[PDB]
Symmetry: C3
Subunit: 160 residues, 3 copies
């Protein structure tokens, strides 16, 4: 139809020793990884919130608790898939997703295409409706010191 | 019509003793509040900027001077309603709003539905076109240290 | 048509004495300037990234490397024009751009119309489809201490 909606998402996680670095579903070689419930995939979380936001469904904290037995061990791609399911349940179709990762290190350019392919598969979208961008923070703040990684996302949906 | 436009907004205010904590029009019980010339409602200001931006009307500083005495302690819902009136006068209807609050404390989940209802009333929208998300900053930076609260917003409008 | 897409952009640069301050194509008198490859125009970079993102074409790093002889001596307005040409070639018409500059100083309001005019010319857009907003960071963080300047952008396009 013509009932378009926009959503915007934000996430950040600390970088800590002793955990794999997983962003956009991609395991990236690195001496640290993101701290959170399961894989702490900051990019998928930001997209997830943008999609909930566009459908006016709240946010991750309203949908996915640590205690739901359906979602206890769930990695962030299972949660992205569930998000997409609830968006459809509310009567919306996803039109496109754009996003930005902010990380001072490691280099993410080798991994961007795989992230895009993972997101497109999880959202049942063609590749040309999914975009992932990657920036440093020019050595400013906790991002520039390598203390965490931020992701931003925007999503367009339509109510059919 | 199909003459859609998108806008985005950002705001931050310091958290200090001796001020009311007003977010999304809701007076939240808390030992600190947000510092500003107005009532310092960081969520409504971000949404206000997103709406002005979608209509290419500038920003909240252009329309409501931060140094004008008439706005000392101003009700930011009244400012939001006048923003919406000017956006309508420019020829735009609002289609949806999404937003994020980033705060270490207090817990905002008990207040989100009330915020959504306030925004929807001020924009003459049904609740299903308004979304408010609430996150921490995962202990990072001045937001992690509870020194301020940030808000982000996105808005879709259409010129009729 | 009805095939709308949204994009979002982010950029940040350090602010130190010894370089000019160029934002939105406007040189602004100031005791500090932004550090980057050439003019370090944080606003035009964020808009460029939002436009590539809406078209699902990647980001600035994928299109304009520092070493490429075609763009080694290019300022950010030439990059923005080339970005717009590629977005057009991919089949997309730009519908509007909105943006925010976060800088604790200097005051940017006097320069907003000039920035809008530069951006609209570079994108071949009517002025009333381009918006620029400017905020402080309320003295919080590296932005609030004047150590950097950030820009955020949103763009709406339609595939024709
Ligand atoms: C709870 O709101 C969040 C959380 C989060 N990441 S997390 O704490 O690892 C987490 C927590 C719970 C679930 N179900 C999944 C992940 N990112 C963004 N917003
Ligand atoms: C001036 O640009 C701002 C200001 C602001 N908050 S404020 O200084 O309390 C304020 C002061 C006066 C009015 N009329 C409204 C708000 N938030 C976001 N952008
Ligand atoms: C490379 O991705 C960037 C770069 C940047 N600024 S920059 O490193 O000065 C720069 C680098 C290369 C060119 N061609 C122009 C500017 N800002 C945002 N994203
Ligand atoms: Mg930030
Ligand atoms: Zn997360
Ligand atoms: Zn404010
Ligand atoms: Zn830049």
């Amino acid at each position: 139809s013509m009932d378009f909606r926009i959503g915007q998402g934000y996430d950040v996680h600390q970088l800590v020793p002793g955990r794999p670095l997983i962003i956009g579903g991609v395991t990236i070689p690195y001496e640290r990884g993101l701290l959170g419930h399961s894989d702490a995939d900051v990019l998928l979380h930001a997209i997830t919130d943008a999609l909930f936001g566009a459908a006016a469904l709240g946010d991750i904290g309203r949908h996915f608790s640590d205690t739901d037995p359906r979602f206890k061990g769930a990695d962030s791609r299972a949660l992205l898939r569930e998000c997409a399911s609830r968006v459809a349940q509310a009567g919306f179709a996803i039109r496109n997703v754009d996003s930005t990762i902010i990380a001072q290190a490691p280099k993410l350019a080798p991994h961007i295409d795989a992230m895009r392919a993972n997101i497109a598969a999880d959202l049942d979208l063609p590749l040309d409706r999914v975009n992932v961008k990657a920036k440093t923070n020019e050595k400013l703040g906790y991002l520039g010191r390598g203390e965490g990684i931020e992701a931003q996302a925007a999503a367009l949906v339509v109510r059919e």
